[PDB]
């Protein structure tokens, strides 16, 4: 059913949840915007692939060729089956031949875009997530220790953050991950725009069965009129995916500008502590860590208590 | 089966339960009215989508065209399949063409409304829920500490609440979330009202197979009588969804008026404590926090014990 | 299968079990009679809906029209499909037209009754259950404390119960919940009685295909004899549901009389304790709390030990 | 499959296991004989219902009418579908009409017997189980305390049991539960015996399609020969259920005689303790408690250690 079809990918955490792997100690390894972009960019093509070929929008068949009435049912089944296979050939289907390729393999191409839009999230989850996750746990752990020793009166962190500032290996991976995702979406928009630009009267191709014995057989008609049934649904879903992508593309490029998103005063709330001195100019790992810090610094008890004092 | 169909979305906590994510420490991130509205607004279209295309209300096919008796079964299958695809074309189906689009894609449009009615709950669950959830835990934790230190005789909270009063970023997100949900429901009511207003004798369209080879073929009839079978069920379910929505719309707009819903004396029960002095005029975060406080202040043991003393 | 069909809703806790939500701390939020009534009133229509359209009581089709032998199979399939859709129209099916509506949508109407009989339990589970559940935990917790301090010799509760006595907001919700359930059951009995009163020779309707091109077509017969196959099963199940409901209705109205069900001496067993003085006349929350107390006071260890002493 | 069909209800604890409800603290709320009787009396009709309509004993259809060769397949499908519905009518199927009702609804009647044989177990599980379960836990808890204080030398229980002796409310519920189960089994035996007594040449009924337009139609044959296919399987399974029931009936009536089953010396093993004096004549709750005690007194460590000393 369509309702349970959407339930698997939307209305429930398909890939929008923290993974059930007890190795990252329960932390957000992706930003809220990145997780939202990944879910929409990957979960929408999957939704549209299964929506297009649901048992409540389709008759059951995806191609239908009008055979002559003299043919038996199995002979007519042969024409429908042959012409479905006779889309990737040359000495037949004389109607082009490029839109017919796309119509037959449209669910595959959407799946290919789903794969290409999931790898950069997967590349980030291994090449850069465990390194940041281990660093994130240390930073949160030492901040609590600094708070505990400062409240017990009744700059190791500064040097460590400066060390991350000079290095820029992590931020390049993040930018490359976003750039790769943006390119695929831009490539997807070009394909979907081209696919939607295809005329509706293009799935009708003049197929023919003339090979081997059938060439010297003056019994079958020379040409068969076929119709790829699940095409108007494809073009309807292609523009919907295109509309979402051209709306999702500004979000991706906004994420690409890491330094502008962040604010350097995220850790400036720690200046209230007497044992904490004062602490962005380019594409550095400091900007990337601050964005990850901002997304999960609220979970520790030391930050919320300190932030309230800053609001006094 | 229909009975197990409803079981998935109703009679069981489909999205009416606290999420099984051990990051919010088991707290209600949505109000009781909001959770009820979200469940009905999202779970009803899903119920109706699968109800309309259940295997016990439909014959199995959704379109049927009366082909001439001279046609073989596969030729008749072609007409049914072609005309099902020949709903989004122009040089055919000369019966309008707008209601035929809606009849074919009615389950998709309901699913689209289900998606558009689930995003504002999802936007609230990330853009504003963790911020409130972290604040909510701190408020409950410090209230117990205040109660413990006051009962041990045998205004940090006041300033913090006043700080939230001047800021109004959280309440705007709540109002925007409710406003966005209200607009979609109002848009849904307009569509469902228009869809139900469509005459029952509109799914009958005069389809035709005349393209390529078939144009120069004086064997098939020029016009075919088709009938979209699953249409009376759609109109029956559309008005049912419309009736619920026009009953759910007053609930949504009532939720929109945040300050009138709340009562400022929710925390006035803490005046019994000697170490607690005395503590709404507009769209401020204080109103939003009080509503969230009222929905979960009863779970802490310090509030119930104190509330009984207030009732003396 | 029918056996596994019943297994889902009966022979197993479908909605007769305590919900797996670790927020009520494992307590009965509904009375034994209310839970039994809710399970029967909701789980029976679901059972009958799926029983009627099981793959072992039906041929597979729900309508069958006797087409002339000159028609092809697909043409005959059109008549069966058209007349199934031609139940909600006027210029056709000249056989009334009210019983035909009910026969086609009988599983929907039973599902509608299942929905309307589940909302008052759901309304009670949110509008009045958490308020009572939080109160119930406090009452049980303080009773153990009173027992512990009284047994350690080797009226806060009285005033609190009196405070609940004057207020009657909770009991009105309970009465309204039962009254709403009773009305729906009474409405269901009227419908089922009317549906069962329909003559068995009413599903036979004289359908016709005369619209657009088919009107000026002297090839098809003017009138078609159709037969809604799954009708005798519906009437068999309708009376069964009617018989249960007219047996369940006295149970519901008995529950409506809250003060007569309760006994005021439920907490009189605590008079044995020296530090416990002595403690119904109308529709008050005290009656509602006593009923909930009576259903779960046996789980605490302090009550059973004290009750035995009362039996001396 | 039949093998996995039986697996659900037999070879695995379908209802023969202690319920997974952490409210009875893991105790046997039903006797071993009662649980065995309930499992067989309820799990057998469910097994036979699904066995009769398995996809490996049936052709797929349950009725088949021999239409004339001039009919099309859909017309022949109409006759099979109509006559399947034309079993509850009068001006047709002139073959009686009582066995035809039973043959069509035999799986329903077995399911009805399954329901009626499950309610008394369900009535016992709520009206009398929690009361006994709470009492059972107290009795076991105090027996350990008595053993602990008697072994520490290096009649509250007597009065409590006597108090239960005068009261007989619990035993009446047990007897009524067994009596209700016995009546249903006796009613089931009468039905199954009558159903098995039906001649094998009774499912063949002379159906007819003569109503509305078909009466004035000298094209169809006046009478149709039909055959309810799944009837010999029903009679085979009916006698099997009958044989088990007439074997299960003596077990039920043996359980009805509560005082004869029990032995009063179950707790006489506690006379070894110096601080335990000496402790059936009719239908009293003392007999019921002793039966429940005998079924679960072996789980406590104090009883086994004491019982060994009694065997010296
Ligand atoms: C491409 C551009 C060249 C077009 C061209 O001139 O040749 C055309 C034909 O040759 C083709 O291009 C056929 C291949 C189409 C692509 C199928 C993708 C399947 C995805 C798989 C996804 C699954 C991943 C999991 C010639 O025609 P034309 O002159 O273009 O008009
Ligand atoms: C929400 C649903 C998408 C609506 C699709 C409309 C298809 C119209 C087809 C038609 O008549 O001829 C189209 C012309 O006109 C258009 O191309 C209309 C483009 C609509 C863009 C929707 C933005 C969201 C021809 O092109 P096509 O048949 O789309 O291929
Ligand atoms: C729309 C208003 C314009 C109507 C108009 O004049 O053009 C009409 C045709 O052109 C159309 O409008 C076709 C598109 C209909 C919308 C389909 C939604 C699919 C949802 C997808 C949901 C899936 C999301 C997952 C012309 O006819 P008219 O003169 O209106 O009479
Ligand atoms: C619970 C079930 C909904 C009942 C649907 C009634 C459909 C009647 C169709 C008919 O005869 O002609 C209708 C006129 O009359 C109506 O429009 C009746 C409107 C009923 C509103 C129900 C409110 C809840 C024509 O319009 P339509 O065929 O509905 O398209
Ligand atoms: C109703 C009483 C009026 C009858 C009347 O006079 O008009 C009759 C027709 O018009 C109708 O009444 C058709 C609608 C029947 C109700 C369908 C419920 C679907 C439930 C959906 C449940 C799904 C929820 C999920 C006219 O005929 P009559 O003169 O009565 O003889
Ligand atoms: C357990 C099974 C229910 C038994 C249903 C009996 C249907 C008899 C149909 C018939 O011959 O003509 C019926 C007359 O007679 C009755 O209405 C009999 C009513 C039976 C009430 C059962 C109470 C439980 C005519 O009315 P109908 O065909 O029921 O529609
Ligand atoms: C019954 C005895 C009366 C027989 C009689 O004389 O009338 C007979 C007909 O009328 C009937 O009795 C039809 C009803 C048969 C019972 C169906 C049970 C469905 C269970 C539903 C279980 C589902 C629960 C979930 C007349 O014929 P006769 O003269 O007997 O020969
Ligand atoms: C293990 C399997 C049960 C065996 C069923 C035997 C059916 C025989 C049918 C036949 O020939 O005419 C039967 C006569 O004879 C009987 O009634 C035989 C009774 C068998 C009792 C089995 C007890 C276990 C006629 O009655 P029926 O056809 O059973 O209806």
From Swiss-Prot, chains A, B, C, D:
It is found in: Cell membrane; Endoplasmic reticulum membrane. The chain crosses the membrane at residues 40-60, 104-124, 179-199, 228-248. The modification S-nitrosocysteine is found at residues 39, 305. Coiled coil: none annotated. Residues 61-103, 200-227 are extracellular. Keywords: Calcium, Calcium channel, Calcium transport, Cell membrane, Differentiation, Disease variant, Disulfide bond, Endoplasmic reticulum, Glycoprotein, Ion channel, Ion transport, Membrane, Oogenesis, Phosphoprotein, S-nitrosylation, Transmembrane, Transmembrane helix, Transport. One of its GO terms (biological process) is response to ATP. Widely expressed. Highest expression is observed in oocytes and brain. Detected at very low levels in sperm cells. Residues 1-39, 125-178 are cytoplasmic. Disulfide bonds join 65-226, 83-207. GO terms for cellular component: bleb; endoplasmic reticulum; endoplasmic reticulum membrane; gap junction; membrane; plasma membrane; protein-containing complex. It is a multi-pass membrane protein. Changing residue 74 to E: Loss of voltage-dependence and anion selectivity. Strong increase in permeability of sodium over chloride. One of its GO terms (molecular function) is transmembrane transporter binding. Its main location: membrane. S-nitrosylation inhibits channel currents and ATP release. N-glycosylation plays a role in cell surface targeting. Glycosylation at its extracellular surface makes unlikely that two oligomers could dock to form an intercellular channel such as in gap junctions. Exists in three glycosylation states: non-glycosylated (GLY0), high-mannose glycosylated (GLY1), and fully mature glycosylated (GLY2). It catalyses: chloride(in) = chloride(out); iodide(out) = iodide(in); ATP(in) = ATP(out); K(+)(in) = K(+)(out). Glycans are attached at residue 216. The modification Phosphotyrosine is found at residue 160. It is linked to Oocyte/zygote/embryo maturation arrest 7: An autosomal dominant infertility disorder due to oocyte degeneration and death, which may occur before or after fertilization. Belongs to the pannexin family. Ion channel involved in a variety of physiological functions such as blood pressure regulation, apoptotic cell clearance and oogenesis. Forms anion-selective channels with relatively low conductance and an order of permeabilities: nitrate>iodide>chlroride>>aspartate=glutamate=gluconate. Can release ATP upon activation through phosphorylation or cleavage at C-terminus. May play a role as a Ca(2+)-leak channel to regulate ER Ca(2+) homeostasis. Homoheptameric. This is Pannexin-1. It comes from Homo sapiens. The gene is PANX1.
């Amino acid at each position: 059913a369509i309702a349970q079809l959407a339930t698997e990918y939307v209305f429930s955490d398909f890939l929008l949840k923290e993974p059930t792997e007890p190795k990252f100690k329960g932390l957000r390894l992706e930003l809220a915007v990145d997780k939202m972009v990944t879910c929409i960019a990957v979960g929408l093509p999957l939704l549209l692939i299964s929506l297009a070929f649901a048992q409540e929008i389709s008759i059951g068949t995806q191609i239908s060729c009008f055979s002559p009435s003299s043919f038996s049912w199995r002979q007519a089944a042969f024409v429908d089956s042959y012409c479905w296979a006779a889309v990737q050939q040359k000495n037949s289907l004389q109607s082009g031949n490029l839109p017919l390729w796309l119509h037959k393999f449209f669910p595959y191409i959407l799946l290919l875009f789903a794969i290409l839009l999931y790898l950069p999230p997967l590349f980030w989850r291994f090449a850069a997530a465990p390194h940041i996750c281990s660093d994130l746990k240390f930073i949160m752990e030492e901040l609590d220790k600094v708070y505990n020793r400062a409240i017990k009166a009744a700059p190791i962190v500064e040097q460590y953050l400066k060390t991350k500032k000079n290095s820029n290996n992590l931020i390049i991976k993040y930018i490359s991950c976003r750039l790769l995702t943006l390119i695929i979406i831009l490539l997807a928009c070009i394909y979907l725009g081209y696919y939607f630009s295809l005329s509706s009267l293009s799935d009708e191709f003049v197929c023919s069965i003339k090979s081997g014995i059938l060439r010297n057989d003056s019994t079958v008609p020379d040409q068969f009129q076929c119709k790829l049934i699940a095409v108007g649904i494809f073009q309807l879903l292609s523009v919907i995916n295109l509309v979402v992508y051209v709306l999702l593309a500004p979000v991706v490029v906004y994420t690409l500008f890491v330094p502008f998103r962040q604010k350097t005063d995220v850790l400036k709330v720690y200046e209230i502590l007497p044992t904490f001195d004062v602490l962005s100019e380019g594409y550095n790992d400091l900007s990337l860590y601050n964005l990850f810090l901002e997304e999960n610094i609220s979970e520790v008890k030391s930050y919320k208590c300190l932030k309230v004092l800053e609001n006094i």
